[PDB]
DNA sequence: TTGTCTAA
DNA sequence: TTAGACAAT
């Protein structure tokens, strides 16, 4: 939710104290003469150090099945599957730590499981998911009784 | 213990004066017109997906989200809150269908 | 009945495509994954 | 240059078997060993499981362009 | 009654204001858009009787981060209803120091006249229209809104030649969108839309603005 | 009948709506799309600019640039089986009748 | 019985 | 802005 930018993140962390040093010249724009000084830095004092760009990152990075297709692209999931197999990774090496039974699978097999079993109920093309999802908001509304 | 306005009118720019007392971050509506012309096309999107599910759900059925996303980005597809109606086949390319 | 009948006719070229994008009987692109995730609904009951 | 699933898909199995079942029918010539049967569906089906079915599929992708893909190559289920 | 009731308004339209200043890629700093409404009685007047909050002086012109010639000011009219007088009166002060966007925060709203003028006042005039109603909640911080990142072209080519695309065969987004029109796009623009999903996370579609 | 003349054979809608919409069907025949907002308001702009009758058979940049976007993407017949291309072919046809 | 389309 | 007209179960 927090805002992000390269001049932001500088102004944060770097000029605060910086402005709070006293000035009391008049507001050029109607913006304060401490924007006036940090714009002042940002434009001249900085140049081609702008490692802000790097550390606020220039986006987030995108949803592992928009970039990199999960059909082709091997144990790339939704961000949810992703979180479900990590929290049962985390759930499952504690109750193995104690476990007197086989145990035949490590984490890495059982991960590899799942991302697999994700991989392969992809629906296939050629489903014609319009008329499933037709049918679905079709066939109870003949069961949707008023009373 | 989150109270709710659970109100029974539709202004929505009513209650942008009250922000300080409201948390109009979470603000809903049952109107798709409303929130398609204060917030939205892309947030009158989520609202058709979950009033269908309110009205399923009140009567027990459990529609699965996939569908109800699917039935919110066709009607949602031109960017204007379209029908299903007669009225809608008008924009489809095929004449036999229409 | 009549309401089943034009959800139906309003929906029925949405196939999903090779590249697995909900798309329409003349290429018109709903959705680029199903569903949000690309997922099947029988086929995500253990997962 | 084919980027598909690799994985044959259920409706690829159902028109591979079916139009191989009618390449086994009118006196058409069978490439594994059978034990008698007289169902074509058998017989299309075991070829399956034989890898044996020389079909190349013309997957169409959207556009009106396809990749040529093989029953040989396809992984099924 | 325009004492607390206007001082309250007029901070919470200049933070919706230097929140979507920061929204579109312009320089606004941390401290202009965490103005505690303290600060802004320090640094702006308290009662219009008095005229001390100059509206007037209200405004301000924030550079681009690309480059600094890309401005645009942020106008707030004194006259609730504008006509085709103070749209040439700005566009005298547009002209003078050479730029091409600009903002006009109205009160009440504007003649058609002028509002035709403003859509009809040169393909190099770049220009818009912000009530003052519709910019007390800032809609970008809405749960249903996903979050809108605009699109370069070198983006659009590649995301067309993927997946064998058109962009008639497109989903389509109207130029009158309130987050379109908060965006500032004009058409053939693509925009990313990041969905805040419950089956997946995140869920990116993509949106021509016609 | 009703908005064409006894002794004239020609109507009674004004030039530039009848220029408009000539130059907007040929741009959706190539199904372009992108156009149709551009032709409206190069209109405006000359109808700003100059307004005339004068201008009996085309303006010049109307034609000019339903000429360019004829030439551009010139196998253009086949792109127009879309939806979003029959709407406003449709649209605009209703939009002329009524 | 709705819900939009057409004409005054 | 509001009454006839047109189609469906």
Redesign the interface.
Known sequence: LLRRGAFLSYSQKIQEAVKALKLESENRNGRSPGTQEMLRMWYELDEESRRKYQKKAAACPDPSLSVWRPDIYFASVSETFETKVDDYSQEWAAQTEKSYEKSELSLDRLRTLLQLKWQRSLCEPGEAVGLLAAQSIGEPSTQMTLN | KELVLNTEGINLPELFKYAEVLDLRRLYSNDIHAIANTYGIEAALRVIEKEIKDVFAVYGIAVDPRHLSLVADYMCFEGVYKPLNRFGIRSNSSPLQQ | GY??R????????????????????????????????????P??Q?? | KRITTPYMTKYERARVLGTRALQIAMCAPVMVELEGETDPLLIAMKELKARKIPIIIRRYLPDGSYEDWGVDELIIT | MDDEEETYRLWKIRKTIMQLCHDRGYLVTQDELDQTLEEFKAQFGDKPSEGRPRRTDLTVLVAHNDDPTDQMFVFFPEEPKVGIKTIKVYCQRMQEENITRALIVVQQGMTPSAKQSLVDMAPKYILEQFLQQELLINITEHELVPEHVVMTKEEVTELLARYKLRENQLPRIQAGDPVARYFGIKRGQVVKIIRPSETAGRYITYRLVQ | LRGSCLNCHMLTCPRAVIHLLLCQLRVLEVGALQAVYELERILNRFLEENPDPSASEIREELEQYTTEIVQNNLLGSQGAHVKNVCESKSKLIALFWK
């Open positions: 309401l089943q034009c959800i139906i006719k309003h929906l029925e070229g949405l196939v999903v495509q090779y590249d697995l994008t909900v798309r329409d009987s003349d290429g018109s692109v709903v959705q680029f994954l199903y569903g949000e995730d690309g997922l099947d609904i086929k995500t253990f997962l």
